[PDB]
RNA sequence: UAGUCCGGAUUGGAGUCUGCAACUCGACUCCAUGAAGUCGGAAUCGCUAGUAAUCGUGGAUCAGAAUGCCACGGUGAAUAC
RNA sequence: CCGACUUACCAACCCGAUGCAAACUGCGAAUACCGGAGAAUGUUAUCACGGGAGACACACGGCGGGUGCUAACGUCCGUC
RNA sequence: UCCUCCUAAAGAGUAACGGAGGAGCACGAAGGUUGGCUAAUCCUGGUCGGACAUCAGGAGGUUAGUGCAAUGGCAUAAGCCAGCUUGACUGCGAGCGUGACGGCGCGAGCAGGUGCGAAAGCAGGUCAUAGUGAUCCGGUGGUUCUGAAUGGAAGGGCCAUC
RNA sequence: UGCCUGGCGGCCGUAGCGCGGUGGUCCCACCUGACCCCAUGCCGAACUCAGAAGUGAAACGCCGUAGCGCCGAUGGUAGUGUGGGGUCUCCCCAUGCGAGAGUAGGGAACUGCCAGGCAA
RNA sequence: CGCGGGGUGGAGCAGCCUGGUAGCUCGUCGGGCUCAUAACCCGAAGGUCGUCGGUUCAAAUCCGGCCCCCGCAACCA
RNA sequence: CGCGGGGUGGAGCAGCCUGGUAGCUCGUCGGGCUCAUAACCCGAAGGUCGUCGGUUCAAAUCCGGCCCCCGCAACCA
C-alpha cells in the first residue's frame, strides 16, 4: 500500500535490525530512534535501512 | 469555580493511592496557612497530624503560610512521624503544583527523614 | 445485500462472586468498562478485568456514578 | 493607571450610593478589555494576518493571541483549526493605560464620529463597539499601513445589569448618543 | 393515508401479539370505539373507517385517531420462491389488541355517537364496542 | 509621466438673468465633490489646396434658451511612381 | 433603501395529556447458568487415559422466534 | 475471509439466498509520560460578517468528541493542548479465557537496561472489538551448530527477516 | 462537652437544584503588588511568590421553605417455572415466584477521625 | 431483485485514469460587410459540471444513499 | 525485484556525442500584405534543463542517492 517496509539497523557493529513501516510520500527525512540491542545489551542509535 | 476545579485534580491521584493502600500525607496549601496530616492505609482516618494552626509553632515564625513556615512544619510533620513510627509514605500532591511551599515542605521532610 | 456477521467473541463474566480464584484467572471479559477495578484487581489491556492476587470475587457498586465495581478479599 | 486611583476613589464613592451598597465589595469594577480582530479573508493570503498581527502587535503593549478555528464552515472555506484573527484579553496596570489612550484621544479622532450606542449591551452588563478606522490611534502614521481594516472591542465588567454597567460607564464621562 | 415518514428501519419482525392494550379510557373525546377482537388493523382499514365515522355526523364535532400504524407489512410478489430475501413494504398495520380506544369522539349527542361508530364498525375486521368518558 | 495641477461628467450647497411662471423641463455664475477614458476590435469616413488640420469671431432663429446651421478671418502641411 | 403590515396554511423547540419499537432503556421478573455449605437417594451415575465404533440426510408434537400469508405434514435455529 | 448490532428465548453459544452497515489501513506520532484543560447546540451585542468565519457574557449539560462502521465505555477522563522523550525494548512468564486441532487473546510478577516525574509510580504501541493468510520453495544480514577421509568451502541448521 | 470551621473519608440523589435569610473574634474566599522561583502557545484571569488596609456582594458553609428532582409500601394488574384444559394465530384452572406504573406517605441527610477558634 | 457506462452553457460533446486552472462545434446577443437576407468577419455574455453528505491543502474529478437513461436476461422439461 | 534509457518553453524532439553552443515546428501578440481565413517575412516574451550533492576554470551533459515514466525478457512461494 502507501506504507512500505524498511530497517532500522543498529548502530553499531551488531547486525541486529527492527523491522517497521514509513510512509515515504510524507516523510522524506530518515529514522534514528533508541531501542535496545540484545548483543551488545545497553541502547544504542539506530539507523534505516531497506 | 476555582474549589471544585482543584479537587478534580487530586482525584487521579488519590484514587492510585488507595489502589496502592499505602500511607498517604495530604497537603491543603492555603493562603495564610498551611495543612499536612498523614493519613493511614484505610484511608479513613489520620495517624501524624502537623500544621501552623497550632500556635506552639505559629509564633516561631514572621508570617503564618510562606517557603520558610511551610518548611517548617515539613521538619515538624516528620518529627512526629518517627516518633510513632512511620517513616515510608507517599506523597499527595492534593490538586496544588509541587513548586513552593509544598516542595519546601516536602524536601524539609525528606532532609527531617521522611523515607519518601 | 445482507448475509454478513461476524465470530462471536465469548464476552461476559467468567467467573461470578464466591469463588476463590487464583492470581492471573480473568474475572470479566468486556468491551467497554461496564465492571471496574477493585481491591486486587487490575485492568487489563482490553478492559478485561482479571485476579492480581488469589481470593474471592466479590462485586459491589462503588463510587457517587453508581458504577460496578469487582474487588477481591483476601481469603 | 492615572484613572485608576480616579477610579479607587472618585467613582467608588459615587456608586455606592445610587444602588445602595450595604457594603463596600458589592462595587462594579471593570475586569477585561478585548483586542480582537478577526480579518477573515487570510484563506487566500498568509501575510495578511501578520500584519493584522502587527497593528494590533503596535496598539498593544504585549503579543497577541492567534485564534484558530473553531469548526469547518465551507460557507465560507475555512477548515478545522485555521488561522482567522488574533485578540489580547489585556488585564493588569496597561488595561488602564488603554481605557485613556482610547477614550480621550481616539475615541473623537473618528472620522464621522457623534457618539456611542446606549444600546450595545448583552444584559449581564457587557458593553461592546465596532470600529471601522484604524488611523485612530497614535501608532499609526498611515504610511506604514495599508488597509482599511477595522476591529471589535469588548469591555467585560463585573456587574449584574446592564443599567449598572452603563452607569459604571458614565462615570468615566462617555459621549452616548 | 397514515404513514410514518422516515423511520428507522424499512423492513422488519411479525412479532406476537399478545397481551391485553394500554389505552383503555376515553382520554380527549367523551366517547371511544373501544376493540375487543385482537388482530391488526392497515393504513386502508382505518381510512376507510374514517371517511365513514366522519361523514355520519357530516361535518361537526372532533375526530380522534389515537391509534398510527408503524409496523410496515412485507409479501412476496406473485411466481416467486421462498427464501431470496425479504419482500417489499406493502401496507402499514397496527397491533390491536383488547380494550384499545382507537376512535373517539366529542361535539356530538350520545344518540349520534351511537349511530357514527356503529357505521364504522362494519369497516373493520375487529369486534369493537362503544364506551363513555367515566368519571375520572 | 502619475489617471498625476491630465480630464471633465456627475452631484451637494449658495446665487444671476429672462419671462405671468424655471417642478416635470432653461442658460449661466460661485465653491466643493470629482468618474470614465492611457489613441480605442471587426469595419469605415473626408481632403490634393492656402485644402486638410487647428483656433477664435459674427449672424439668422429668439423673451430667454445650442457643441447645431450659415458666415468670417488667423496658423497652415504631407502625398499624387 | 430602511423596511412596517398580514395570512382561506404547515411546523420545530418547551408544558400537559395518549400510544409504538428486533436493530430504544433513567426500570425489570419467572426460569436458566456459576460457585460454596448441608441432608437423603443413585450397582461411580463424574473425571482422566488407552483399544474398537458408529455417526456427521433427521421427522413430528409442546413452548420461544426468524421466514412465509402469525398459509403449507413448508422451511431455518433454541429447548423438551 | 475478518469486524459490529439484531434475530438469540436476561451466562457462553446458536442457523437461513434473515434484517443493518464496515475492513484488506492509518500515525515517528494521533505513541509514552509529566502537568494543565473539558464541550456541542442555542439566546445577546459587535468592523468587513450575511443562515454558517472572530470575540465577550449567559443558559445548558456531554445531545460533543473519541483517525474510519456499529455497539459497549470514558471528566480518576480513554476528549483537547503543551514540555520532555522513544517501552512501538530484549530475554521470560505463575495463572486463566477461547478453540476439534493448528492457533488466538489476557497476564501480575522476574532479570538487563531506558524515558518521564520531586516522588509515589507508569510505559513491552494507539479506548476496545476488523486492517489479514498455513506449509513447501527461494532471497537478505548474522551465529564455526554441522559440514559425508583431513583442514576449509558449498550446502543445510538456528536467529532476524522479505 | 456543645456551638463552629477547615482537612481526609464511609455511604453516595431520603444525600441534589430553585427561592429567601444569615455568618466573619478564628477558619475561607475575594482582595494589594509583582525586580526575584514560576507562568500566559497574549494577558499575575488561571498558575506561583511576597503580604494583607478592607469586605462578606460573588463564593462557600448553615437554616427555613418541598415549586421540582429523588425515594416508596399494602392491594390489584402484566408476566411466568411446573402439572392439566379449551372457542389452542390466543387464553383459562391448580400451585410456587412476583414487577413496572401509579397512590397514601416519606423526603431538602447521616456519620467516623484529627486539628484550631470560642463559651465553659 | 442485476452488471458496466453516462447525466457538464440554448442542443449537445471532451476534460476524470495522474484533484489547485474549464476547452470545442452549432446556437444566442450586439456590431460590421450588402440595396437586403444568408454566408463570412469581430467582440462579448453564456456551464450551481444530476443531487446530498463526507474525506482530502484543493472535489466535475474519489466513495456511497437516492433520481433519471440504455442494452442484455424471463433458459431445459 | 534485475537491466536498458530518458524527463528540455504551452507540447515533443535536437542539443547529452569527445564537458565552454537552450534551437527548430506549431502556438501568442503587433506590424507589413491580400477582399478574407490561410500561406509568407521581421521583432519580442516564454525553460531551477526532474532534484540534491560531489569532481571542476565551466555541467542540462560525467557520477552517486532519490522521484516518476517507458520499453524488455523473465515469474517453480
Not at chain 4, 487570510?42 to 498593544?60: E, F, M, P, V
Not at chain 5, 422516515?6 to 373501544?34: E, I, P, W
Request: hydrophobic share 40%; glycine share 8%; charged share 30%.
Amino acid at each position: 500500500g502507501i506504507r512500505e517496509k524498511i530497517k532500522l539497523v543498529s548502530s553499531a557493529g551488531t547486525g541486529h535490525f527492527y523491522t517497521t513501516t514509513k510512509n515515504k510520500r510524507t516523510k522524506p527525512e530518515k529514522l534514528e530512534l533508541k531501542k535496545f540491542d540484545p548483543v551488545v545489551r545497553q541502547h544504542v542509535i539506530y539507523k534505516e535501512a531497506k | 469555580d476555582k474549589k471544585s476545579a482543584r479537587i478534580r485534580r487530586a482525584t487521579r491521584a488519590r484514587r492510585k493511592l488507595q489502589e496502592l493502600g499505602a500511607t498517604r500525607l495530604v497537603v491543603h496549601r492555603t493562603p495564610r496557612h498551611i495543612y499536612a496530616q498523614v493519613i493511614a492505609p484505610n484511608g479513613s482516618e489520620v495517624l501524624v497530624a502537623a500544621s501552623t494552626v497550632e500556635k506552639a509553632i505559629a509564633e516561631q515564625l514572621k508570617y503564618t503560610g510562606n517557603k520558610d513556615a511551610a518548611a517548617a512544619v515539613g521538619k515538624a510533620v516528620a518529627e512526629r512521624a518517627l516518633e510513632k513510627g512511620i517513616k515510608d509514605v507517599s506523597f499527595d500532591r492534593s490538586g496544588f503544583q509541587y513548586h513552593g511551599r509544598v516542595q519546601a515542605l516536602a524536601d524539609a521532610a525528606r532532609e527531617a527523614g521522611l523515607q519518601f | 445485500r445482507n448475509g454478513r456477521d461476524s465470530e462471536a467473541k465469548r464476552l461476559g463474566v467468567k467467573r461470578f462472586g464466591g469463588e476463590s480464584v487464583l492470581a492471573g484467572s480473568i474475572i470479566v471479559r468486556q468491551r467497554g468498562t461496564k465492571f471496574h477495578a477493585g481491591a486486587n484487581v487490575g485492568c487489563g489491556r482490553d478492559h478485561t478485568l482479571f485476579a492480581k492476587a488469589d481470593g474471592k470475587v466479590k462485586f459491589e457498586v462503588k463510587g457517587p456514578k453508581n458504577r460496578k465495581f469487582i474487588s477481591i478479599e483476601a481469603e | 493607571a492615572k484613572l485608576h486611583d480616579y477610579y479607587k476613589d472618585e467613582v467608588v464613592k459615587k456608586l455606592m450610593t445610587e444602588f445602595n451598597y450595604n457594603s463596600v465589595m458589592q462595587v462594579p469594577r471593570v475586569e477585561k478589555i478585548t483586542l480582537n480582530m478577526g480579518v477573515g479573508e487570510a484563506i487566500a493570503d498568509k501575510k495578511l494576518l501578520d500584519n493584522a498581527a502587527a497593528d494590533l502587535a503596535a496598539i498593544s503593549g504585549q503579543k497577541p493571541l492567534i485564534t484558530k478555528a473553531r469548526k469547518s464552515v465551507a460557507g465560507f472555506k475555512i477548515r478545522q483549526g485555521y488561522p482567522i484573527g488574533c485578540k489580547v484579553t489585556l488585564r493588569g496596570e496597561r488595561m488602564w493605560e488603554f481605557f485613556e489612550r482610547l477614550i480621550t484621544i481616539a475615541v473623537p479622532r473618528i472620522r464621522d464620529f457623534r457618539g456611542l450606542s446606549a444600546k450595545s449591551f448583552d444584559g449581564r452588563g457587557n458593553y461592546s463597539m465596532g470600529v471601522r478606522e484604524q488611523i485612530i490611534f497614535p501608532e499609526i502614521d498611515y504610511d506604514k499601513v495599508d488597509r482599511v481594516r477595522g476591529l471589535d472591542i469588548t469591555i467585560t465588567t463585573t456587574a449584574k445589569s446592564d443599567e449598572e454597567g452603563r452607569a459604571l460607564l458614565a462615570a468615566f464621562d462617555f459621549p452616548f448618543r | 393515508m397514515l404513514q410514518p415518514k422516515r423511520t428507522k428501519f424499512r423492513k422488519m419482525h411479525k412479532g406476537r401479539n399478545r397481551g391485553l392494550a394500554q389505552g383503555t379510557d376515553v382520554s380527549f373525546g367523551s366517547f371511544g370505539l373501544k376493540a375487543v377482537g385482537r388482530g391488526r388493523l392497515t393504513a386502508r382499514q382505518i381510512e376507510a373507517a374514517r371517511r365513514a365515522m366522519t361523514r355520519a355526523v357530516k361535518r361537526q364535532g372532533k375526530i380522534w385517531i389515537r391509534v398510527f400504524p408503524d409496523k410496515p407489512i412485507t409479501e412476496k410478489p406473485l411466481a416467486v420462491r421462498m427464501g431470496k430475501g425479504k419482500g417489499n413494504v406493502e401496507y402499514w398495520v397496527a397491533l390491536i389488541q383488547p380494550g384499545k380506544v382507537l376512535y373517539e369522539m366529542d361535539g356530538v349527542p350520545e344518540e349520534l355517537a351511537r349511530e357514527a361508530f356503529k357505521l364504522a364498525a362494519a369497516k373493520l375486521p375487529i369486534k369493537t364496542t362503544f364506551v363513555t368518558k367515566t368519571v375520572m
